């Protein structure tokens, strides 16, 4: 029955931390926002960061979901266009100030470096290894060790997003970084 | 009163050097600051007049290790005898794979520093040290026609994300000598893809 409490808390936390950042909202305010007492919260979550970790899992589920929606909606013929769409998708979604706030800004501080690496690993890595293997098997990409490439691309993409997120002129930085990523990948991709 | 100040400058350096050695070998976590004070020729009070806490001393250790990583980078690149900006860039990536492979660097910079400094703190370190060098190389490649005119800082920023991830993928690998080789070819392909020469 406590499964329900969990979800009301996660939902409330996501909304409030979404709008005002981890720092600006405390857990009592979230408990009110959910239909829950503080004791019901502390039966279910050890501390602020544990609740935040579950908020990230749910935000990631949906960032993954959006990614696959935007990529499918782009009408990509081949693995090369699939990859090309995937990068555009990631630039839009990471630009959404909920994602920007929770994932790009708060999560690195609240989770470690260690903790944060693992989140991108869980969610992106397989999807990225997937796309690459398809590009290789379709002749659009040289046969190469798949995980190192993937691992490196993830470093490039996450840094792109955070460069933007923190930029002096964010709408400009998005556009330029978009072309930069496109050139980087269009360099390796056959067609 | 000169000689307490001079002795204090001297203490600072023995502490930085001692911390670097000990944390170099066994990691931030496994060595405590009292052990470092012994290792130097210093008392606890001499340490705490010069460093507020463990992490402050660690930050100074990072600065000195970075100075040398930067220094080595420029030494390896110059020593490679690269004709053009393209070869310069090519050498720079090989150099970074060797230097980051140095177990001191691996330990202090690739593993400990991200945990001890924040995300925020750690970003700033790569920014300070690499960014200019990377923007430099790129601008030369562009000005020499070996690279399309592009916004320079975004590209640089992105390449740094790629390189730092390369090094850490290796640093943490089940088979590190293999992971270095594969990641080397990966980076080479990525840059040979963009570079005209």
The CA distance from A101 to the nearest CA of chain B, in Å, is 14
The CA distance from A73 to the nearest CA of chain B, in Å, is 27
Instruction: Return d(Cα B32, Cα A49) in angstroms, integer.
Output: 27
Instruction: Return d(Cα A102, Cα A96) in angstroms, integer.
Output: 10
Token digits of residue B115: 């945990």
- Other Cβ atoms closer than 10 A to A110: 20
Interchain contact, B166 vs A151, CB within 8 Å: yes
CA atoms B46, B49, B53, B54: torsion sign: negative
| DSSP 8-state secondary structure symbol assigned to residue A33 | H
Instruction: Return d(Cα A48, Cα A29) in angstroms, integer.
Output: 12
Interchain contact, B114 vs A113, CB within 8 Å: yes
Which residue do the tokens 């903790």 mark?
A115
Q: Torsion angle, CA of A77/A80/A85/A91, rounded to 10 degrees?
A: 180
Instruction: State the structure-solving technique.
Output: X-ray
Interchain contact, B120 vs A112, CB within 8 Å: no
Interchain contact, A159 vs B162, CB within 8 Å: yes
What is the domain partition of chain B in residue ranges? Answer: 1-197
Instruction: Return d(Cα B108, Cα B62) in angstroms, integer.
Output: 7
Chain A residue with Cα closest to B173: A148
**Long-range contacts of residues A44-47, Cβ cutoff 8 Å, at least 24 apart:** A44/A2, A44/A5, A44/A6, A44/A9, A45/A9
Asked if A11 and A35 touch (Cβ cutoff 8 Å), the reply is: no
Q: Which residues in B67-89 are b (16+ Cβ under 10 Å) and which e?
A: ebbbebbeebbeeeeeeebbbbb
Token digits of residue B144: 């020499």
In terms of Cα–Cα distance, which of A87, A111, A79, A75 is closest to A159? A87
Question: Who among B160, B168, B190 is closest to A184 (CB)?
Answer: B190
Give chain B as a 3 state SS string: CHHHHHHHHHHHHHHHHHHHHHHHHHHHHHCCHHHHHHHCCCCHHHHHHHCCCHHHHHHHHHHHHHHHHHHHHHHHHHHHCCCCHHHHHHHHHHHHHHHHHCHHHHHHHHHHHHHHCCHHHHHHHHHHHHHHHHHHHHHHHHHCCCCCCCCHHHHHHHHHHHHHHHHHHHHCCCCHHHHHHHHHHHHHHHHHHHCCC
Residues whose CB is less than 8 angstroms from the CB of residue B69 and which lie 6 or more positions away in sequence, other chains included: B99, B100, B105, B109, B129
Q: Which residues in A49-61 are b (16+ Cβ under 10 Å) and which e?
A: eebbebbbeebbe
Chain B residues contacting A, CB < 8 Å?
A: 114-115, 118-120, 122-123, 148, 150-151, 154-155, 157-166, 168-169, 179, 182-183, 185-187, 189-190, 192-194
Asked if B131 and B156 touch (Cβ cutoff 8 Å), the reply is: yes
CA atoms A93, A67, A70, A127: torsion sign: positive
Tell how far CA B29 is from the center of its chain: 19
Q: Which residues in B137-148 are b (16+ Cβ under 10 Å) and which e?
A: bbebbbeeebbe
**Long-range contacts of residues B48-51, Cβ cutoff 8 Å, at least 24 apart:** B49/B8, B50/B8, B50/B11, B50/B12, B50/B15, B51/B15
Interchain contact, B165 vs A151, CB within 8 Å: yes
Asked if B52 and B77 touch (Cβ cutoff 8 Å), the reply is: no
Which DSSP helix (H) or strand (E) runs through A46? none
- Number of alpha carbons in the 13 Å side-chain half-sphere of residue B41: 7
Asked if B187 and B91 touch (Cβ cutoff 8 Å), the reply is: no
Cα B174 to Cα B171, B177, B179, distances in angstroms: 9, 9, 8
């Amino acid at each position: 029955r406590s499964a329900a409490t969990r979800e009301a808390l996660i939902t409330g936390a996501r909304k409030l931390w979404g709008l005002r950042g981890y720092a600006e909202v405390g857990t009592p305010e979230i408990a009110t926002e959910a239909g829950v007492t503080r004791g019901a919260m502390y039966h279910q979550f050890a501390d602020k960061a544990a609740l935040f970790r579950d908020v990230v899992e749910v935000v990631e589920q949906d960032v993954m979901a959006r990614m696959a929606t935007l990529v499918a909606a782009s009408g990509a013929a081949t693995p090369a266009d699939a990859i090309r769409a995937a990068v555009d998708a990631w630039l839009e979604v990471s630009g959404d100030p909920e994602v920007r706030q929770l994932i790009l800004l708060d999560a690195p501080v609240v989770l470690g470096w260690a903790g944060f690496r693992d989140v991108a690993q869980r969610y992106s890595l397989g999807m990225t290894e997937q796309l690459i293997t398809e590009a290789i098997r379709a002749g659009q990409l040289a046969r190469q060790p798949v995980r190192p490439l993937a691992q490196v691309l993830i470093g490039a993409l996450d840094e792109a997003a955070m460069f933007i997120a923190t930029a002096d002129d964010p709408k400009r930085a998005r556009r330029e970084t978009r072309q930069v990523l496109r050139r980087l990948i269009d360099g390796m991709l056959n067609g």
